Amino acid sequence: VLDLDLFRVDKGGDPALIRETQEKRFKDPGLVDQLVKADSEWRRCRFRADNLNKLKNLCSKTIGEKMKKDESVPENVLSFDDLTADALANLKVSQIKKVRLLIDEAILKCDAERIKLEAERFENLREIGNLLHPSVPISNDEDVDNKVERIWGDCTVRKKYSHVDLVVMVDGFEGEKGAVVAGSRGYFLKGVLVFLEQALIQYALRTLGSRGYIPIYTPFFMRKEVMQEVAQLSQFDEELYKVIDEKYLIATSEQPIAALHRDEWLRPEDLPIKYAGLSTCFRQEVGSHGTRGIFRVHQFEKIEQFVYSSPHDNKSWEMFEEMITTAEEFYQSLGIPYHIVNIVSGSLNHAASKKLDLEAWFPGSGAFRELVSCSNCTDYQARRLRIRYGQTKKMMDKVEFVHMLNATMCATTRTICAILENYQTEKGITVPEKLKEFMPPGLQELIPFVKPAP
Amino acid sequence: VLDLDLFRVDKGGDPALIRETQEKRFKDPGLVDQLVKADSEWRRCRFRADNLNKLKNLCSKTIGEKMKKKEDESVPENVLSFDDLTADALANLKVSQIKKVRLLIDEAILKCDAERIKLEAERFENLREIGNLLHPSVPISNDEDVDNKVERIWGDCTVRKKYSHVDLVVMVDGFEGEKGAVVAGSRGYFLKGVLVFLEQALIQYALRTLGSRGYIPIYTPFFMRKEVMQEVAQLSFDEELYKVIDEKYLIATSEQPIAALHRDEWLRPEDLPIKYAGLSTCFRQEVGSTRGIFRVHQFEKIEQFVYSSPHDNKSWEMFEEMITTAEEFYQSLGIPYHIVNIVSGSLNHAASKKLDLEAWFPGSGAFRELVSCSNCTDYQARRLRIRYGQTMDKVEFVHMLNATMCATTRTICAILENYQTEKGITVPEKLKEFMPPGLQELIPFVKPAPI
Ligand SMILES: [Mg+2]
Numbered sequence: 050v051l052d053l054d055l056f057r058v059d060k061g062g063d064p065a066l067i068r069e070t071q072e073k074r075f076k077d078p079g080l081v082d083q084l085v086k087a088d089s090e091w092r093r094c095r096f097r098a099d100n101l102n103k104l105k106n107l108c109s110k111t112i113g114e115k116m117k118k119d120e121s122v123p124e125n126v127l128s129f130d131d132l133t134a135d136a137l138a139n140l141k142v143s144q145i146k147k148v149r150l151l152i153d154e155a156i157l158k159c160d161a162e163r164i165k166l167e168a169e170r171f172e173n174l175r176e177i178g179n180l181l182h183p184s185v186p187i188s189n190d191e192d193v194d195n196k197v198e199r200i201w202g203d204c205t206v207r208k209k210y211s212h213v214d215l216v217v218m219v220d221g222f223e224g225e226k227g228a229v230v231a232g233s234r235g236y237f238l239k240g241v242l243v244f245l246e247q248a249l250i251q252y253a254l255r256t257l258g259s260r261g262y263i264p265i266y267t268p269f270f271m272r273k274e275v276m277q278e279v280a281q282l283s284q285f286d287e288e289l290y291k292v293i294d295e296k297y298l299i300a301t302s303e304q305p306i307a308a309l310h311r312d313e314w315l316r317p318e319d320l321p322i323k324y325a326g327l328s329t330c331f332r333q334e335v336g337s338h339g340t341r342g343i344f345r346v347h348q349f350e351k352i353e354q355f356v357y358s359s360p361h362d363n364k365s366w367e368m369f370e371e372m373i374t375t376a377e378e379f380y381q382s383l384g385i386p387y388h389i390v391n392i393v394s395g396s397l398n399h400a401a402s403k404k405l406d407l408e409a410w411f412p413g414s415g416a417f418r419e420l421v422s423c424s425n426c427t428d429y430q431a432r433r434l435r436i437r438y439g440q441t442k443k444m445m446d447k448v449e450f451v452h453m454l455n456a457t458m459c460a461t462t463r464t465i466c467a468i469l470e471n472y473q474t475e476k477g478i479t480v481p482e483k484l485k486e487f488m489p490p491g492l493q494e495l496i497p498f499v500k501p502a503p
Numbered sequence: 504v505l506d507l508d509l510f511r512v513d514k515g516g517d518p519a520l521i522r523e524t525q526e527k528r529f530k531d532p533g534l535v536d537q538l539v540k541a542d543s544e545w546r547r548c549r550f551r552a553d554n555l556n557k558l559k560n561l562c563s564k565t566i567g568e569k570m571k572k573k574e575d576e577s578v579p580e581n582v583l584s585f586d587d588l589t590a591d592a593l594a595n596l597k598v599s600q601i602k603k604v605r606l607l608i609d610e611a612i613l614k615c616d617a618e619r620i621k622l623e624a625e626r627f628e629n630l631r632e633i634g635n636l637l638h639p640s641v642p643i644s645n646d647e648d649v650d651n652k653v654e655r656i657w658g659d660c661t662v663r664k665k666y667s668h669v670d671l672v673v674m675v676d677g678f679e680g681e682k683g684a685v686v687a688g689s690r691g692y693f694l695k696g697v698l699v700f701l702e703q704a705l706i707q708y709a710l711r712t713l714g715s716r717g718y719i720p721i722y723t724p725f726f727m728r729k730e731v732m733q734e735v736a737q738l739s740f741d742e743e744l745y746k747v748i749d750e751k752y753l754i755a756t757s758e759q760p761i762a763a764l765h766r767d768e769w770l771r772p773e774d775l776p777i778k779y780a781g782l783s784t785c786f787r788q789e790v791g792s793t794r795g796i797f798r799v800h801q802f803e804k805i806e807q808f809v810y811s812s813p814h815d816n817k818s819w820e821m822f823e824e825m826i827t828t829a830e831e832f833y834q835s836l837g838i839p840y841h842i843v844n845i846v847s848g849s850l851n852h853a854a855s856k857k858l859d860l861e862a863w864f865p866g867s868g869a870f871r872e873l874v875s876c877s878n879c880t881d882y883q884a885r886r887l888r889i890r891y892g893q894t895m896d897k898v899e900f901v902h903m904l905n906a907t908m909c910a911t912t913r914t915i916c917a918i919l920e921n922y923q924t925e926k927g928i929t930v931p932e933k934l935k936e937f938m939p940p941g942l943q944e945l946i947p948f949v950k951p952a953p954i
């Protein structure tokens with residue numbers, strides 16, 4: 050969520066800049082005007098209600114000195130404007146009472162507004178997205194305007210089989226009974242594919258590990274209270290699962306890891322802190338209808354990159370590029386062709402300044418499909434989670450919050466499909482060099498077709 | 504659930520033995536008698552009704568040949584019986600006699616619709632509560648602590664070492680349980696760094712070991728639909744699992760999804776044994792109520808699931824292979840342990856026998872179970888309807904055995920407590936190959952102990 054001081058010109062903000070961003074994503078720019086308005090009303094109330102406190106006091110102190118010594122009149126010329134220490138000392142105690150009653154009744158009307166405002170403010174702030182990097186293509190149309198930045202390896206080449214067939218032909222896949230047991234799209238992974246996935250996971254962990262990442266195995270479900278801080282409203286509907294306190298099944302490894310450092314002060318010598326998330330992830334995936342394979346599925350393992358960065362100096366954008374670079378070199382090494390894609394503003398979620406997708410070329414399917422997504426969220430989440438930049442070297446008006454980035458480096462199911470269609474040959478699927486050491490004996494070299502293709 | 508013919512003496516049964524068993528288990532010996540009664544009442548109704556009918560036809564048959572070939576008294580008394588009314592005695596009784604005898608047979612025909620209800624009532628209710636046959640070796644007691652039999656011991660289970668698994672897990676900087684309780688709830692945890700690596704080593708080592716002994720590794724869904732989770736899982740809906748919303752449950756073992764894999768199938772005898780190494784993350788609510796990774800709500804588990812032939816000793820030989828395979832595993836990891844034969848009182852209804860491998864924790868000064876192996880014979884297979892062969896005469900069911908070979912967090916604790924030293928945790932030889940460089944000799948203590 051954005052700093053409120055950004056919506057206040059007297060605090061150094063530019064409501065105009067945010068109005069304009071709200072336009073670059075495609076969303077209501079008035080959502081800003083309503084926030085400023087409600088914020089201003091909020092702020093005037095705190096001011097006016099402090100005046101009323103003084104007027105009430107003078108009232109109760111004077112009704113104080115008059116009971117140092119029933120009888121009534123309607124008697125009001127007094128608007129609170131005309132009300133003075135002397136003006137009231139000339140009045141019957143019954144009249145000063147009916148005035149103080151008009152004050153405390155106004156002081157309460159403030160508290161009523163303030164309350165309905167504090168919310169109308171927070172409901173609006175939640176729906177206003179983060180500032181965009183200048184490089185983001187401005188469009189609402191994802192397919193036409195996503196912009197291809199780099200290409201690598203041969204993305205033309207066509208091969209014989211789709212990954213749907215190949216998971217059967219090597220007999221690593223039970224989708225019929227998986228569909229009975231867990232519901233639609235449920236699956237079992239058999240044999241070679243289990244050993245293959247373990248190799249991927251090992252190679253990824255080794256990779257990130259030696260680049261400085263700390264492998265971390267997350268809990269798979271989060272408290273509903275911590276979840277609301279790390280995700281958005283369109284998350285709790287589209288894909289998350291409800292569990293019974295009351296908890297949600299994590300859709301990524303970024304959720305628990307963000308909440309890991311919550312309400313804490315990270316020291317600059319310690320940044321950047323890089324984690325390699327290892328988790329099983331669950332997505333309800335509403336909107337994806339259209340039959341089946343292991344590619345789009347409700348349950349899978351991910352290896353995620355999560356980085357805590359300093360706010361200053363562009364160290365977070367430097368880290369951002371370093372993060373997608375790590376992702377590329379991983380797929381480079383496994384010999385998967387891909388192209389990097391800069392996602393349009395309309396398709397970014399609220400916390401993202403910029404998003405890069407690495408999309409692999411699937412030779413069998415003859416399509417690009419997304420293996421990786423990479424985001425810089427700057428301080429948007431950090432400020433909700435209160436993760437503060439912990440500098441000891443000077444004195445500060447307001448604290449600064451760390452930058453947070455997350456990339457999903459490897460989603461085992463999708464990556465496996467990618468490997469399968471790219472390494473597929475005749476006898477079977479060739480095992481990628483970088484994975485051989487991680488396969489069991491007899492499974493290095495090739496993975497044979499044991500069964501015919503549908 | 505038991506084969507109904509086991510209750511029927513003339514079907515080869517021994518209802519005494521089943522009673523005796525139910526005694527040995529300490530469950531209710533009565534539930535047998537009830538069902539022998541309801542079963543017999545129905546069958547008696549039925550044999551009467553069927554056999555009383557077989558005579559009514561032989562009444563009409565030889566009554567047919569009578570007027571056709573050639574040739575008025577009361578009913579002769581020496582024919583009314585099942586055994587005394589036979590083809591011959593009908594001839595000497597003429598006809599218009601046979602006619603009247605046939606009216607007495609029809610007066611005695613009854614409907615069993617009333618008795619059937621009662622039988623099915625007993626089956627649906629009681630059958631599920633009569634436990635499986637016991638292996639001769641199962642010690643008979645209801646008190647585990649005193650009467651569990653220790654069959655074997657390996658390595659030195661006396662030895663003490665300085666720190667428990669609770670401290671080592673901190674000292675290696677492998678655990679954030681403070682901040683994992685914030686995120687996931689009570690007992691929630693993060694595993695980090697060296698311990699994420701140790702565990703991937705274990706999973707790799709376990710799967711090589713099972714894979715090269717002929718097991719097919721299988722990665723199951725981590726949740727199943729409420730409907731199917733009911734149709735499969737053992738009486739122990741004891742543990743409260745977890746609920747997901749779709750109406751789904753979070754699995755507590757791989758055993759449930761896999762069992763559900765072969766449900767309602769006929770299995771080629773040629774193919775058996777079918778051996779699976781199940782690999783899944785498991786979720787246990789009720790962790791039992793000072794926080795380690797030993798008792799937690801979520802952990803990875805590698806399980807052995809075997810389908811076997813019902814004939815001869817095959818499943819009991821299989822049972823021994825399985826418990827052995829595990830011992831050898833913990834042996835190669837250099838983990839001291841003893842095998843425990845679990846008493847009759849404590850067995851699940853489906854278990855014929857259960858062996859527990861309990862490793863020794865030097866730091867803690869305690870035995871804690873890393874492995875449990877059970878042979879359920881055809882008990883569950885019969886309910887799941889997983890059939891042996893013949894894809895007519897009496898149907899047979901496969902035997903099913905299952906053992907959890909490695910529960911990663913528990914195993915990891917055993918390794919730490921046993922391999923601890925002054926400098927760090929020595930890496931166990933068979934694991935070295937699977938760890939990253941810098942981790943192959945030793946896992947260092949980078950933090951002071953929580954003292
Ligand atoms: Mg996607």
Ligand SMILES: [Mg+2]
Nearest residue numbers: 797798799802
């Ligand atoms: Mg446990």
